[PDB]
Structures are given as C-alpha cells and as structure tokens.
Design a protein around this ligand. Structure first.
Ligand SMILES: O[C@@H]1[C@@H](O)[C@H](O[C@@H]2CO[C@@H](O[C@@H]3CO[C@@H](O[C@@H]4CO[C@@H](O)[C@H](O)[C@H]4O)[C@H](O)[C@H]3O)[C@H](O)[C@H]2O)OC[C@H]1O
Ligand SMILES: [Cl-]
Ligand SMILES: [Zn+2]
Ligand SMILES: [Zn+2]
Ligand SMILES: [Zn+2]
Ligand SMILES: [Zn+2]
Ligand SMILES: [Zn+2]
Length: 371
C-alpha cells in the first residue's frame, strides 16, 4: 500500500465517525500553514490546544488574560464543524508562580503558622475559582470537553504533592470541578486527565479518587487517558482492563494525547528521521492496528481519540529524543549498551500515522482498513 499524499487519502475521521471523534493537538502557527490546515480539514473532527490554553498561557499575571491564541483555535474549529477540548484548567506545570505567593510575595508552601496556612488555602482556592470562571464564562457555548485537572495522582499511587496539594489539600480538585460546572452548566463535560492510567498502583489510586469524589457529589463526567505509549508497552489487555474499570463507574473515556513512540524509556533516539529503520515503521503499524481494533471494540465507552499532533514533522516527543553516542561518535540506540555522551532532546521520534512530508505511513493503512 503506497506512500501517497495524506491530503487526498481516505478521511480518518470518516472511517471512525460512528465510533468516536478523531482529534489533533495544534499550535496556532499551524492554522497559518496550508498543509496543516488542509490536514485538519481533511482528517479530523475534534481539536485541542497543545499549549496556548494552559494556565500560564491564559493568565500569566493575575488579572491579565490572553485569549488571542485560544480564540483562533476556537474560531477555526467552529468554521470547520470540529469539537473542541480544553487543555487544561489546572496543572502543576506550565502554571504561573503568582498563584502560590501569599499577600507579601512569599511562597505559601513555606508558611508554618496554621491559621495563616488556612488563609492561603482560601486565597488560592479563590484564585483558582476566578481563573476557571473567566475561562468558562467565555467558552462554555463553544467548548464541549474540558480537562479540568491534569496529573493530580502521582506514579507512587499517592496524590501528587504539588503546590496545589501542599497548600490546599484535596479541596483544589473539588473546587476545580465544582467551579467548571457552576459557570459552564450541565452541557459541558468535565474530565480528569493523566498518563500511565494503565499502570499500578496509579490506576487504582486514580479509580479510588474519582469514585470518592463522585460519591461526594463532585461533578466528573470522565477520564482522559493521555496515552503517551510505546510499541510494546502498555499491553492492549491492560489498556482494555483500564478502559473497562472506569467505564464501570459510569465515566466516559477519551484517549486525549495519543502518540506511539519509536523508543523505550528513557528513550535512545535516532538523530534524524532518515536514520529510523524501516522495520520500526512496520512494528509501529502492527501496534496501531491492535490499538485501534481495541478502541473500536470498546467504542461504546470511548467518545474521542485525539493524537497529540498532526504529522511527524512536529511532535513534543522530539524534546525527549535524547541521542546517545559511543566513544567513536556512533549513535547508540540499544538500551543497555556502552556509551560516552548524550545530546538531550536532539533526536527525532516518529509517532503518528502521517509522515513529515505529509504522506501516509504504514500505520495509516493499518487503521484505515477493516481488517
Ligand atoms: O513511565 C514514563 C512516564 O514517566 C513518561 O512521562 C510523562 C508523559 O506525560 C507528560 O504530560 C503531558 C505531556 O504533554 C503536555 O504538553 C506538552 C508540554 O510541554 C510543551 O513544551 C509541549 O509542546 C506540549 O506538547 C501535556 O499538556 C501533558 O498533559 C509528562 O510531562 C511526562 O513526565 O511518559 C512515558 C512513560 O514511559
Ligand atoms: Cl473533517
Ligand atoms: Zn469530516
Ligand atoms: Zn526525511
Ligand atoms: Zn464512542
Ligand atoms: Zn508542539
Ligand atoms: Zn486494521
């Protein structure tokens, strides 16, 4: 099956339209390239901001709101009949420091006096509420799906000990969801989003957290499985089990940031796309074949599958593609093998079904067929 141009290959959203929407994460510069725009028009019916809807891009100083970049994404989505997801209202990263400073400009995490801690909790929760209110009041009629909180459970199975948590305890999660519902109404859908949702003890910790909150009347409609995964790991059986476990609680599932790295963890990457050997693309394509067969089987539990980019010329995975060089200056990709130095983030990953020159990959054929 040929490496033809994606711009006029059979539409990916159309193959899957009774199953689930098919989305892409974007940057605003992509809305001004002809190729990106035509790929979004051709192949996708859902969109998400890769960066410009994060807390620090929206409210970088208290009272200063930048919606110019977000607005452009919203406008392109509406003009082209796409669903929109909001990524994301609360995170422990790409968050502005001003949130966690007390009245005299000192870090709140440092405060020892207990009545002064409770004042900070309330102040931070008030700020959290205002940030959410302003965003939801603006977008509630345009944006149907919302990452309310991101990564709030650590990998050790305990609540992640972010400043949000150190300062305000578990109430920050509750206030985030309650605030989105109050200002957005009943028709927006509210998600908790995380990675390694398939992995113990995080999976069960995630599960117990959401069940508890739902029991307490905290509004949560679903789980966002980021799905930054590899060719082998995690297995499909464990994905399937994960999806089913959350669906048992009456939660929707979205696959919110799908990419299939060519590498392991910590990754040892090739320095260029051209160096990646052909067999890696065939392996990837069988992984995607199994993957999307599983998504289809569970289509009644999954409303959306979104890829964390458009085509292989641009992916955040390249920021993790460390290249390992042995003493002779040759590239080392075997995980236990000798090496002398590493150039962090200088290599090239290849995670999507569309290549860097916008032609279809074997993984595409594997997910467009009905075999
Ligand atoms: O077991 C391994 C994990 O440790 C490992 O780590 C995490 C993967 O998920 C990440 O969170 C996602 C990452 O993408 C964010 O957007 C990017 C943030 O920075 C920008 O510069 C870039 O353009 C964005 O695309 C997204 O918002 C966020 O929700 C997390 O940070 C990693 O530690 O994954 C692999 C496992 O094997
Ligand atoms: Cl479309
Ligand atoms: Zn369409
Ligand atoms: Zn090339
Ligand atoms: Zn569905
Ligand atoms: Zn990017
Ligand atoms: Zn297939």
């Amino acid at each position: 099956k040929p490496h033809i141009s994606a711009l006029n290959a059979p539409q990916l959203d159309q193959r899957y339209k009774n199953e689930f929407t098919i989305g892409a994460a974007v940057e605003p510069y992509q809305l001004q390239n002809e190729k990106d725009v035509q790929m979004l028009k051709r192949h996708f019916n859902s969109i998400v901001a890769e960066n410009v809807m994060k807390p620090i891009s929206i409210q970088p100083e208290e009272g200063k709101f930048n919606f110019e970049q977000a607005d452009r994404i919203v406008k392109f989505a509406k003009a082209n009949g796409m669903d929109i997801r909001f990524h994301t209202l609360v995170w422990h990263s790409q968050v502005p420091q001003w949130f966690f400073l007390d009245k005299e400009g000192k870090p709140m995490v440092n405060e020892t006096d207990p009545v002064k801690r409770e004042q900070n909790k309330q102040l931070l929760l008030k700020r959290l509420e205002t940030h959410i209110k302003t965003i939801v009041e603006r977008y509630k009629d345009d944006i149907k799906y919302w990452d309310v909180v991101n990564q709030v459970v650590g990998d050790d199975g305990k609540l992640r000990n972010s400043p949000w948590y150190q300062i305000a305890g578990i109430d920050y999660i509750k206030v985030a969801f309650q605030a989105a519902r109050k200002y957005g109404g009943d028709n927006i859908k509210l998600y908790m989003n995380d990675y390694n949702t398939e992995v113990e003890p995080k999976r069960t910790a995630l599960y117990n957290l959401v069940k508890q909150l739902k029991e307490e009347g905290v509004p949560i409609d679903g789980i966002g499985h980021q799905s930054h995964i590899q060719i082998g790991w995690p297995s499909e059986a464990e994905i399937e089990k994960t999806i089913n476990m959350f669906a048992a609680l009456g939660l929707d599932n979205q696959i919110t940031e799908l990419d299939v790295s060519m590498y392991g963890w910590p990754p040892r990457a090739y320095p260029t796309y051209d160096a990646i050997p052909k067999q890696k693309f065939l392996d990837q394509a069988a992984r995607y074949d199994r993957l999307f067969k599983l998504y289809e089987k569970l289509s009644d539990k999954i409303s959306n599958v979104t890829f964390w980019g458009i085509a292989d010329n641009h992916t955040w995975l390249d920021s993790r593609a460390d290249v390992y060089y042995d003493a002779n200056g040759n590239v080392v990709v075997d995980p236990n093998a000798p090496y002398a130095k590493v150039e962090k983030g200088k290599g090239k990953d290849a995670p999507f079904v569309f290549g860097p020159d916008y032609k279809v990959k074997p993984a595409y054929w594997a997910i467009i067929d009905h075999k």
